[PDB]
């Protein structure tokens, strides 16, 4: 009582019926697999980004003043 062992006959048709997809590419991909010391220290950098907010806001205000002087000299 022998039988048929293995084939791939109707399989490509079955696979292309439901539309073989590219994987779900998303913006801001995950960090699973990145090396742990560099994940550790980017976590420290994201922890200490809140330090220096007054310097960042003041320098952004001076950059707005610089763009205002530039558009005043241009217009």
């Amino acid at each position: 009582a022998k039988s048929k062992n293995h084939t791939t006959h109707n399989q490509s048709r079955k696979w292309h019926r439901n539309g073989i997809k590219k994987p779900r590419s998303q913006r801001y991909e995950s960090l699973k697999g990145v090396d742990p010391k560099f994940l550790r220290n980017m976590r420290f950098a994201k922890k200490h980004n809140k330090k220096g907010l007054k310097k960042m806001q003041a320098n952004n205000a001076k950059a707005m003043a610089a763009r205002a002087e530039a558009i005043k000299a241009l217009v």
């Binding site: 399989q11 997809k21 590219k22 994987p23 697999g33």
Partner: peptide, 16 residues
């Protein structure tokens, strides 16, 4: 490390 695309028979997987 590299995220490559492997077609495992019915779908393309972005695997690392």
């Amino acid at each position: 490390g590299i995220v490559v695309n492997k077609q495992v028979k019915g779908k393309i997987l972005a695997k690392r």
